[PDB]
Amino acid sequence: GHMTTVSTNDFDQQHLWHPYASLPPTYPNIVIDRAEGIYIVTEDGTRLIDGMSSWWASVHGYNHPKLNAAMIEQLGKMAHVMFGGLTHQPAIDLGKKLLSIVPAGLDAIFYADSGSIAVEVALKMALQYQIAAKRPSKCQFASTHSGYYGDTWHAMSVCDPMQHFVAAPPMGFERDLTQSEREALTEFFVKNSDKLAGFIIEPIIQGAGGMRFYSPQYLQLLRKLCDEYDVLLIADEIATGFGRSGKLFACEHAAISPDIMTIGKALTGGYMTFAATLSTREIADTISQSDYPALMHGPTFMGNPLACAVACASIDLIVSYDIEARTENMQAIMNEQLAPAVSLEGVKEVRCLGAVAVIELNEAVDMPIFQTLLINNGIWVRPFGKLVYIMPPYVITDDELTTLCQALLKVVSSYLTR
Amino acid sequence: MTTVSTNDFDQQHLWHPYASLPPTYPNIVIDRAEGIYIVTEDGTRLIDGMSSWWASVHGYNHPKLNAAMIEQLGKMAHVMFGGLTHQPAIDLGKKLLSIVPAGLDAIFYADSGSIAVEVALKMALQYQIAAKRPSKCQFASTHSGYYGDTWHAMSVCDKQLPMQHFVAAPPMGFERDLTQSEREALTEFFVKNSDKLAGFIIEPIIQGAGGMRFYSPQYLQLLRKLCDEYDVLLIADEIATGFGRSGKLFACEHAAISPDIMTIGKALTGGYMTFAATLSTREIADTISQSDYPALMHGPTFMGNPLACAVACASIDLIVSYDIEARTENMQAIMNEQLAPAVSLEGVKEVRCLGAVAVIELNEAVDMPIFQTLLINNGIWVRPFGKLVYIMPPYVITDDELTTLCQALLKVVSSYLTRK
Ligand SMILES: *Cc1c(COP(=O)(O)O)cnc(C)c1O
Numbered sequence: 001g002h003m004t005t006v007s008t009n010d011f012d013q014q015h016l017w018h019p020y021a022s023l024p025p026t027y028p029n030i031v032i033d034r035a036e037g038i039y040i041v042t043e044d045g046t047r048l049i050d051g052m053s054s055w056w057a058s059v060h061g062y063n064h065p066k067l068n069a070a071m072i073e074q075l076g077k078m079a080h081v082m083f084g085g086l087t088h089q090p091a092i093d094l095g096k097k098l099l100s101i102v103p104a105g106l107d108a109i110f111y112a113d114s115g116s117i118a119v120e121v122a123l124k125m126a127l128q129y130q131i132a133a134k135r136p137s138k139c140q141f142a143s144t145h146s147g148y149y150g151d152t153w154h155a156m157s158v159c160d161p162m163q164h165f166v167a168a169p170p171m172g173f174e175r176d177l178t179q180s181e182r183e184a185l186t187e188f189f190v191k192n193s194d195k196l197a198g199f200i201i202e203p204i205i206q207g208a209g210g211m212r213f214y215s216p217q218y219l220q221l222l223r224k225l226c227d228e229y230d231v232l233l234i235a236d237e238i239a240t241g242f243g244r245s246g247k248l249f250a251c252e253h254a255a256i257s258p259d260i261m262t263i264g265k266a267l268t269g270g271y272m273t274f275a276a277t278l279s280t281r282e283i284a285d286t287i288s289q290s291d292y293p294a295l296m297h298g299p300t301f302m303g304n305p306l307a308c309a310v311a312c313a314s315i316d317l318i319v320s321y322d323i324e325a326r327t328e329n330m331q332a333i334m335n336e337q338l339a340p341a342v343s344l345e346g347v348k349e350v351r352c353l354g355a356v357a358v359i360e361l362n363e364a365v366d367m368p369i370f371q372t373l374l375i376n377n378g379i380w381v382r383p384f385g386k387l388v389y390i391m392p393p394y395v396i397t398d399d400e401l402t403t404l405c406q407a408l409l410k411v412v413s414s415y416l417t418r
Numbered sequence: 419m420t421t422v423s424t425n426d427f428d429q430q431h432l433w434h435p436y437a438s439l440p441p442t443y444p445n446i447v448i449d450r451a452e453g454i455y456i457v458t459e460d461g462t463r464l465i466d467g468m469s470s471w472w473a474s475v476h477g478y479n480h481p482k483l484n485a486a487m488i489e490q491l492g493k494m495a496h497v498m499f500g501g502l503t504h505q506p507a508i509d510l511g512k513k514l515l516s517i518v519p520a521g522l523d524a525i526f527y528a529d530s531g532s533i534a535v536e537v538a539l540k541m542a543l544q545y546q547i548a549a550k551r552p553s554k555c556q557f558a559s560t561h562s563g564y565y566g567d568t569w570h571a572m573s574v575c576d577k578q579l580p581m582q583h584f585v586a587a588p589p590m591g592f593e594r595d596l597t598q599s600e601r602e603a604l605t606e607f608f609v610k611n612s613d614k615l616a617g618f619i620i621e622p623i624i625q626g627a628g629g630m631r632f633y634s635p636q637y638l639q640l641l642r643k644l645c646d647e648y649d650v651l652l653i654a655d656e657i658a659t660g661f662g663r664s665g666k667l668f669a670c671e672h673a674a675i676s677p678d679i680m681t682i683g684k685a686l687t688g689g690y691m692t693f694a695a696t697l698s699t700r701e702i703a704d705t706i707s708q709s710d711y712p713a714l715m716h717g718p719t720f721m722g723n724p725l726a727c728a729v730a731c732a733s734i735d736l737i738v739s740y741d742i743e744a745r746t747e748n749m750q751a752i753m754n755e756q757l758a759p760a761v762s763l764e765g766v767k768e769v770r771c772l773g774a775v776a777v778i779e780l781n782e783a784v785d786m787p788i789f790q791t792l793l794i795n796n797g798i799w800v801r802p803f804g805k806l807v808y809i810m811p812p813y814v815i816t817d818d819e820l821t822t823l824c825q826a827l828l829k830v831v832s833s834y835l836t837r838k
């Protein structure tokens with residue numbers, strides 16, 4: 001029985017763009033002062049459980065002592081040094097850690113400033129590879145109809161220049177493919193493979209594209225087709241990587257390895273922008289031994305040592321958790337607590353996988369109404385379209401997670417009153 | 419005799435910028451940095467003449483940058499910018515609007531310079547669509563520019579990569595007057611093409627990665643007038659020039675013009691971390707915002723990162739505390755005096771200095787393996803490209819440090835040319 005009204009920072013409101021709002025926005029942004037654990041804290045002292053982990057990334061929560069200490073240790077040596085002609089121990093130590101954990105066969109690492117740049121580099125690698133392999137007709141990309149891979153211009157092109165699309169994979173993590181579905185994908189490759197440098201996909205969970213979960217069988221078939229038809233499989237694990245689907249990398253659900261993989265977000269525990277593009281040795285060698293041996297990208301802050309150092313700490317934490325058990329427990333609690341939402345007339349369905357839960361509504365969320373329910377219930381959630389979803393941090397306790405899910409179910413129920 | 423540290427894991431597994439894997443020459447392992455120096459794993463200090471690619475303008479391990487980082491870490495390294503804001507974003511924004519060219523009023527924080535450029539181009543396209551000039555859907559630049567390595571930025575850099583429009587590289591020389599023929603050609607380009615152009619993008623005064631070229635403020639003044647008269651947005655990429663590099667805080671100041679859109683980065687954070695911003699006029703922000711597509715269609719996950727904002731506040735406060743014009747005029751004077759004798763060397767074409775940039779342009783491309791073997795023993799780190807041996811030292815460098823750097827550089831260049 002409440003509505004909470006936040007106070008507008010006039011400077012923000014007039015002068016600063018934010019990702020999904022006009023300038024000025026119709027409704028002001030909430031000023032956050034600090035954060036700790038699973039909580040963000042408003043300028044007035046109100047603590048809110050961040051159910052979003054700051055868009056998938058803050059998987060250890062906020063103000064983590066180990067992450068902070070790792071950042072500070074590196075700071076005392078150097079925040080940054082250029083990577084042209086120079087290297088450093090954080091880059092080396094991170095690289096060794098990554099090669100020890102990522103899907104087998106990935107052997108070369110291109111550090112990037114952001115996920116979208118990692119994707120741009122993945123696409124460039126694939127193009128240069130095919131040119132080096134003397135298959136210059138293989139100059140386009142394919143994806144499924146429901147994907148998302150970043151907001152830079154090349155990434156935009158395979159998000160739902162011209163590219164090629166197949167059906168969105170069928171919804172349902174436990175659903176078996178049909179013969180018709182298998183044949184259609186196969187037919188797509190028979191028809192188009194000579195034009196395709198690569199097929200790019202988010203493995204298992206398609207995020208910004210609709211929070212869709214699909215079968216590992218789809219990925220298994222895709223891997224086999226890419227093998228037989230000489231198309232590189234590019235797995236965008238920027239959102240899924242480091243545990244989110246219930247395995248360390250979502251590719252593991254299918255027990256496949258991609259030719260190229262992008263990672264980011266949870267890589268640094270959400271502390272700072274950073275990403276990487278990994279490839280096989282075959283790709284790195286083929287390019288490197290070609291007429292164009294240099295990979296034609298190089299961000300100014302490539303390899304940033306501070307990002308590398310926090311990433312080492314973040315990976316060590318993930319490995320320490322028993323990430324499969326942790327996320328299995330998260331899934332079980334979110335499913336139990338949120339399943340009763342289906343009782344509500346304006347709810348379509350509820351679906352949980354690993355450390356992701358989605359309450360899909362029948363109609364688009366009216367954001368101000370929903371949010372004016374947020375503060376009074378002690379939580380922060382950011383819907384998109386018809387989706388009210390959470391991606392909580394792996395450090396969340398059972399009691400904290402229960403509090404978050406009970407609060408969310410109260411918010412959704414109260415919202416569906418208006 | 420110096421033995422530097424190298425690393426077999428790096429050599430086999432880590433890509434470096436625009437490099438093969440493995441590279442033909444190994445990377446030097448850096449352990450730490452302090453002041454103007456980088457320090458190898460074996461303890462060898464090298465003056466970094468590059469400021470880590472234009473950005474480390476206060477040097478390394480600066481106590482005020484470090485303090486800003488530590489202070490923000492105690493509060494939060496990061497929080498999402500969707501529906502939320504924070505004081506570092508606000509305070510940085512206020513600082514920026516106080517110093518940037520007049521008319522810039524709206525700020526889009528970005529993860530990197532390349533993304534800032536991508537966002538600038540998108541703003542310009544959305545603006546023309548909102549203004550009901552949807553034919554204005556292409557971009558122009560000069561030959562010899564550089565604006566980042568992402569796919570849209572690549573297209574304005576000198577079927578699947580989109581076509582754009584180019585004019586001649588501006589004439590070399592900061593003090594050079596334009597000719598009537600040069601004025602007419604540029605004008606003719608606008609008469610011909612302006613109905614197709616959403617914007618004209620350029621690095622003001624100094625064109626960096628494209629050739630370390632200096633050109634006249636008269637050129638930028640003419641371009642601003644043409645863009646005004648022909649309804650083409652002027653996009654000034656100040657990612658490298660911003661915060662003092664050309665001898666003014668922003669290189670646009672040489673021409674006493676303001677762009678419609680400006681990108682900044684690099685020195686913005688004192689080179690501590692990747693971060694950038696795209697600024698526009700109110701007219702652009704409003705016109706989009708009041709259109710059928712009111713939302714600017716970009717949003718990196720780490721947009722507005724508070725840690726980056728907090729170190730950028732500290733970096734700007736430092737720049738404002740310097741007399742940036744006097745500091746860079748003194749740097750120019752020293753670099754010119756110390757490096758001018760290079761022109762007497764067979765295989766040097768010319769030497770040019772402007773503000774805190776010095777370029778020794780050679781007749782032939784630098785043979786990098788040879789060049790590398792002279793660095794360590796002379797106590798400096800410089801990274802040539804093409805035919806160019808250039809430095810962009812930090813604003814904190816002392817007269818004696820800068821003298822040491824330039825005398826060492828002249829010794830390296832001289833020994834390189836006779837070996838080549
Ligand atoms: C977030 C995301 C990206 C983009 O990373 P940014 O850091 O926003 O540039 C790319 N791909 C996927 C799957 C992501 O979730």
Ligand SMILES: *Cc1c(COP(=O)(O)O)cnc(C)c1O
Binds near residue numbers: 300301626656657
């Ligand atoms: C460095 C630079 C960029 C690119 O910034 P990144 O951080 O490498 O993406 C864009 N424009 C200019 C003028 C620059 O110097």
